[PDB]
From a paper:
In Escherichia coli, the 14-cistron phn operon encoding carbon-phosphorus lyase allows for utilisation of phosphorus from a wide range of stable phosphonate compounds containing a C-P bond. The crystal structure of a core enzyme complex, Phn(GHIJ)2, revealed a symmetrical hetero-octamer consisting of a compact, central tetramer of the PhnI and PhnG subunits each interacting individually with the more distal PhnJ and PhnH subunits. Here, we show using single-particle cryogenic electron microscopy that PhnJ mediates binding of a double dimer of the ATP-binding cassette proteins, PhnK and PhnL, to the core complex. ATP hydrolysis induces drastic structural remodelling leading to opening of the core complex and reconfiguration of a metal-binding and putative active site located at the interface between the PhnI and PhnJ subunits.
An initial map generated using 901,800 particles resulted in a structure with an overall resolution of 2.2 Å (using the gold standard Fourier shell correlation (FSC) 0.143 cut-off criterion) of the C–P lyase core complex bound to a single PhnK subunit as previously observed. PhnK displayed a significantly lower resolution than the core PhnGHIJ complex, so we used 3D classification with signal subtraction to focus the refinement on PhnK and obtained a final class consisting of 50,323 particles at a resolution of 2.6 Å. This map had improved density for PhnK and allowed for tracing of the complete fold of the protein. Variability analysis revealed several distinct positions of PhnK representing a hinge-like motion of the ABC domain around the site of interaction. The specific interaction of PhnK with the CID of PhnJ is driven primarily by electrostatic interactions involving negatively charged residues on PhnJ (Glu149, Asp226, Asp228, and Asp229) and a positive patch on PhnK (Arg78, Arg82, and Arg116). These interactions are further stabilised by hydrophobic interaction between PhnJ Tyr158 and PhnK Tyr118. In a subset of 3D classes, additional EM density was visible near the P-loop of PhnK. In summary, we conclude that when a single PhnK subunit binds to the C–P lyase core complex, it is structurally disordered and cannot engage in ATP hydrolysis. Moreover, and in contrast to previous observations, we observe no significant structural changes in the PhnGHIJ core complex, including the putative Fe4S4 cluster site, upon binding of a single subunit PhnK (rmsd = 0.5 Å).
Residue numbers in the entry:
A (entry chain I): 3 to 250
B (entry chain D): 3 to 278
C (entry chain H): 4 to 278
D (entry chain A): 3 to 144
E (entry chain C), F (entry chain G): 1 to 353
G (entry chain B): 2 to 43, 45 to 194
Write the structure that this text describes.
Amino acid sequence: QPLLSVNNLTHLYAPGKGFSDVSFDLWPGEVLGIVGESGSGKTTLLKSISARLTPQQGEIHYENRSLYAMSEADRRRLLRTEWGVVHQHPLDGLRRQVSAGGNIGERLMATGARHYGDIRATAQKWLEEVEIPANRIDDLPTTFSGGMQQRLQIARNLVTHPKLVFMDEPTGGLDVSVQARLLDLLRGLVVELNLAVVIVTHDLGAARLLADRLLVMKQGQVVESGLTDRVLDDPHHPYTQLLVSSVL
Amino acid sequence: NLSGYNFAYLDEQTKRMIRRAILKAVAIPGYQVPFGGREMPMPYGWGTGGIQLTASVIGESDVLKVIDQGADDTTNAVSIRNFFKRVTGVNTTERTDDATVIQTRHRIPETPLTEDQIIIFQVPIPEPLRFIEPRETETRTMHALEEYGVMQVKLYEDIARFGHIATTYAYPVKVNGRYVMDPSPIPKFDNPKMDMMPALQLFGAGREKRIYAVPPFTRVESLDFDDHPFTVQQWDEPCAICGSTHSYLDEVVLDDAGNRMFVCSDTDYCRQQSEA
Amino acid sequence: LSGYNFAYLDEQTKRMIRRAILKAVAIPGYQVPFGGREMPMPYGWGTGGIQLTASVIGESDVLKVIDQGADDTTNAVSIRNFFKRVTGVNTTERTDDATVIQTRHRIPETPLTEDQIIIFQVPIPEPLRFIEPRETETRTMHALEEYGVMQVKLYEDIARFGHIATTYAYPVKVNGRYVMDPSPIPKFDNPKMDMMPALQLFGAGREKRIYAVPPFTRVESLDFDDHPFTVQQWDEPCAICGSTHSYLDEVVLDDAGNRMFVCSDTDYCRQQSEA
Amino acid sequence: ADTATRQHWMSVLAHSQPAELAARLNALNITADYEVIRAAETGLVQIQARMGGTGERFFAGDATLTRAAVRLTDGTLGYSWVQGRDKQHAERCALIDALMQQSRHFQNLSETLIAPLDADRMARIAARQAEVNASRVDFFTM
Amino acid sequence: MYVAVKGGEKAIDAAHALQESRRRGDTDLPELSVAQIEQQLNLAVDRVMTEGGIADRELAALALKQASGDNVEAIFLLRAYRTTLAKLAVSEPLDTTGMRLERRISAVYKDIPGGQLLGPTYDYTHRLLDFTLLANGEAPTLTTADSEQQPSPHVFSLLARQGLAKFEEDSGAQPDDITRTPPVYPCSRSSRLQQLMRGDEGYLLALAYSTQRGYGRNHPFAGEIRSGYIDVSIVPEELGFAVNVGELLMTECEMVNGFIDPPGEPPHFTRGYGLVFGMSERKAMAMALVDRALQAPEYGEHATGPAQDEEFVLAHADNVEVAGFVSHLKLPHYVDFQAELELLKRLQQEQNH
Amino acid sequence: MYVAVKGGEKAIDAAHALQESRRRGDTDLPELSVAQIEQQLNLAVDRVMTEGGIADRELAALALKQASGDNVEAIFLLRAYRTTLAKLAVSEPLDTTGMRLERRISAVYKDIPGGQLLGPTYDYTHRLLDFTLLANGEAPTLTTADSEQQPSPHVFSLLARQGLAKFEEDSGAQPDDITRTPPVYPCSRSSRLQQLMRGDEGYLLALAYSTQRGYGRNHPFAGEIRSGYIDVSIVPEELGFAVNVGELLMTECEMVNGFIDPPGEPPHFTRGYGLVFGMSERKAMAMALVDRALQAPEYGEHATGPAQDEEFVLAHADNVEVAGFVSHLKLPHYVDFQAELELLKRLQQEQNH
Amino acid sequence: TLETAFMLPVQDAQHSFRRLLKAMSEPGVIVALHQLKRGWQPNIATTSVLLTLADNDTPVWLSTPLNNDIVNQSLRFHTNAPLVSQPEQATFAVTDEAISSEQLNALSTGTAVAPEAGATLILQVASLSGGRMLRLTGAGIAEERMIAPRLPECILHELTERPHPFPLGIDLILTCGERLLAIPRTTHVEVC
Ligand SMILES: [Zn+2]
Ligand SMILES: [Zn+2]
Ligand SMILES: [Zn+2]
Ligand SMILES: [Zn+2]
């Protein structure tokens, strides 16, 4: 049955701002993208679904368990053992004073690794997995580049083999070459690991490259369910045409 | 007691409050129980929490032993002992075995403690996560959820940066298998003495308003990795007086030429060994 | 004859302040750092203005010290008495008779003429300080002339209230290049700074900055076409002189709520009343 | 005597300076055998203020307070709570509180002791207020 | 061979004798009495009473004398003495509206009902050292005026009557006492105010200065500074009615701050409050500014500067705690340093055999 | 019909007369001498000298007397007096090794060469208010010992000779003088130290406390605290040789901080330095801790806590500036507040329905 | 009318607290509180515990069998504690072997973020030896302690199952005559 069922989620902190009557389901291994204007409230949807913002009304059902029915400890554990969150700003999801190896192995240690050699070996393996050179494992995030910081964030979140990762436009602020290479790496990871990805972006190019199914939101509600190369090339509802033409 | 102050200098209300806190802490080993500490004659940072704890537990028939840095004659130790003789009149002893209540600062006596003995610790920072997470609003929740990952992360970072754990005193210890607790800033040489000890251990942070405890015969395990096991301080030299190799030594600089001697930190233990 | 050096300041301090003044005049709007000393008045009570006046004042000068536009305000009285003690110069309450004017939060209603110098007392000599508290950052902003953040704040104010929340110390562009804040004067007084015939000096002793506007310089308040620069307005005239073109201040007469509006510029009020 | 008048003389006694009260009582040379049920005790009164002057309450420190109680032979109880630390003053105030509750002493003391003390305090207040009003700033007239 | 000896007790005895001798100073000069200190060093006594928690002038002056004039040591002495005393009663809430004014100023209006009473202040004085104080002087003769006290309503009462400010309404909430229980962040405004009142004057002044300089701007105006005598009243158990126990010299400061625009309601000024013992105003102004800064959560303001950080501001505000823990480093710490030395020597031996 | 009267100067004069009369206090008590303050309130005098910038005990005591004991006002009086005086010479660098010790304590070793000289101190005293000081008594006679000062090397000399720390090398860089030019951030360590020494004791203490509680820890140890007399020497133009002009009572604190591991040399302890006038240790200790905290850029450390932020720490350290600006709000601001009221009244009327 | 209290309140309170601390820190150890010569009927141990711990800050709830008027007056006069009517508000819950399951479940067990906020249950039992044998292990016990108190079924269920996981829970203080026994929330109990 779908791994993340969203049923009529609404939250409007300020008049209009926020989202309302949002419903959909997610199956394992499929990438669902979210596209909309900055005021669309898509980002608020991302916080609400990513066990961070309590909705005013609606229901989330991770696996067959209401998300917010879980105790604070249960959802806190979920956000660090089986779920992943990739913030736009790496320093938000990365511990700045902790070396890259420590950032990657913090999840393992929170699970109780209790073996330095194994933790360091796993950290090096994951640094290789994301193309970061392994020679600078002991380095710290501030000494990395933006693309390298992003790669480190994905490695940190994927160290535990999460079955569902949310991604709040991690490519923002990256060059076209770096963005494309990072997206290619993300495609490789997504196909290699059967983990669902919920990617929120403000541009259609990233969704085209990465997403499998696409959703469009306007002013805090779902506009039309989509699909790669269908909504992108065949925008039905007029705002969809406006968006694609604005990109074009 | 003829100083005009209530026995132990504390009003009965404060003593009752501290006693309730002590009982709650004993019922929840390793948990920092907030308590309404007052201002003692000795300044905050100078052992007011331990002073209040011992004032709440000390009685007429108890034999008090106050040691600072493991020495009875340390200036702060003698000051606290004089205060308690003035406001309590109890007997004071420098021998660990004779003492019934031991108030220690930064050291655990070398002589093992028997039952019915209470050792009271003066802790400046009762939170083991304080230096990783300075905010109490965060560390309180971290303790509630048993989210002690950052401690292991800090140990891992120390190993990566230096090749060894950089914490040498106030070493965090998991007590009873659930709560990670910060002992007094005792050297990691002393953590093994805290495991399954026959005596009740009380830790009081007067400045930080916290009381916690370890009941007798409780599991206390210092955090570490399997491939980097917990170790203790080592010295090549024995005690320069008693010639003991099983005691925490301290360094005394005899002259500017660089001549130095290492002597037992526990003065009572050194005295006992030398007279043998 | 007070036992201190004339104007209370030693010669080298006067020279340093004078070099700072010349540099500031050569760079209209730039905040020139200067090593100000501690004056008998506390920091924030007008030490910068006092130091500037001491550096520029001479024996033949006629000094007018006004606070809130009034000559009899407590701080104005204290500063004027200090200057009378340490210099003995002549003091006046009439704007047209004063060669040097030291003002705290007003530009006199009476227009200033040539050869007059007006010293402004500035608490915060930085229009971007409440946006970017770091001096290390505002300094480079001024160096590169990156004032977009000021426009951002103005637009945010318009969005939140529909109006520029700033009402005094309103930033102004000088000589088309430097955004500076004037003294904490109302928006009412900003127009008076444009193409003024009198040199304007601004001094912040606590923040240790001197800047200036030469005579006949363009001083344009920041605004937008959709939101033209407005000025404080009242529906009442001065309760004493009856003037409708002066910055009024409110005086509460009794707890019942009775109040009267009177000209802030007491000299201008006196001139109008005697007419 | 209603509680208003008792409050009045208790306030007058509390605000009176210890020295002047002692001098007044010695001059009056009043004889009244009594026993101190509660010896003058010094402690704290927790000062409680309102945020904003009229809003929620909050604790604003403490002030030293000396309290005493006295029982006369007949049975009347006098109490005193005086801010400060003078035990003798508190005991004297309690004694006068006890005395004022007796018709034999109320009329005499209210005119010979309480009224002069209140007048002296009011005179001091008026003098101080007169010398302080010289610092008022004048702006307008008529 | 060496043998340990006892020298701690005699060493501390000698040190305390030396400190007492130094405090007495030159025996030729007469020992200054506590009355002289509480009369002529009144501004130091004001800070000592405010931060020590006891509003007794003689006790504060005695602490200052015993502390060799050290404000921190005197504050700690008074605070420690506080523990000894018992709480005989809790006063009725103070009514500042009925204080015998000795000073009343407002920066928001040129003139206000009751006038601008400057009172005894150092403001507008030229801070030039008065060397005539090196020799005994003559008591100045004070001029006088009419002795009547004009009605002096609070400026915020006037503002609220116009609708510009919001009245401070009492909900009957029980105040939080930190002396009874340790603070638990986030703290309610009552406990925040209690902690600020007994906070370091210098620390609070620095935080308020930072807010004024842009680190958490709040746009403050000195709405009302008001120093005078407030009557203190209690309600004993023996007598069911209220009894006036005396009066305290209190300084009350109320700041007008940047107005807000709540939804629905019209915009209004926000306000800050401060209250101290004695005639020292600057502490009250700093308390008001920091209080307004810490009110940020109620108005949903993003903390821009540390002055808006409740944890950081209130954790380090207390003189006794702060001073005690900085000075604790003077205590022997050679066991911990021996541990550090052992580790460092191991590291040095490893890197450079 | 109203008319504007002129009543500012008379009010100012009356207020100042009232303040002077209040400072004199009751005329029955003899006016306390400046010598009495200098001798018996020596710790307040020490703080005033340190933060005022002049190491003259009599001048600091005079400032305290003129300020009615207010430390901030006295500090400002002394700082303002500094301006009038002319700089006659610049002393040769102080050699603290020649200090004639009155107090020397090391917290890092049980015993040191020269011993633990406690000297006069309030440490280890039970802070119980001594009510025998209400009535003057007589100080006890001081016991004596051998009158020779055995060599007292600095503890960091011992540590550096072991290689555990690094000697502070003199590169000949010209010290920065904030008193001559306004501070410019980032600041050299000389300017930072000069600013810290003039900084407020309470603010620096709070910052050091915050660092000790985890807000950017530096793991401090009181390596050595020395109080004693240091000789002062100058080289006049008209004489080609140095001349000894006197001696100052100064306190020096040197703090061992957390060790680092430089890439190309063995790990070693970092150090902090504090130096003040008089025998007020805690100011020197806070100075040393904040000095180490502000050394973050030199060691490439991330600014975790506010105490590590150089601009924030130093822009608000100056007691004189902080106090003056916080106090400026007592000045009339009714023009700015009238502008704010005009804006607010319009905003309210726009949304009035 | 009012019941008497400790003859020497300070010394007796200290001695009783030390005995109670010995009992609590070493679960299963029976201690005697001999300082009070007569409890406020209905025992001595319970009265000593209330006199040495309860005060104005600790609401006390007395079960109906023990909720006598004289004892209420004595608690108000001596301890000054507030006597609440519902177990939910009780910091100290005093009851006997008649305690019902609902009453036991109503007690405050604290919160995971502040487990000390819970309530302490003082249970009066017919005897401390003779009931179902129980084995105790955990903090305070070297190897294992065997105690056979005669206490209700609901309490046995609470101890053996611990429905509220650590740190949540209620510390139990069994009393009988002048003798006392303590079982903290961290003790693992198992029938025989
Ligand atoms: Zn320590
Ligand atoms: Zn030995
Ligand atoms: Zn201003
Ligand atoms: Zn007019």
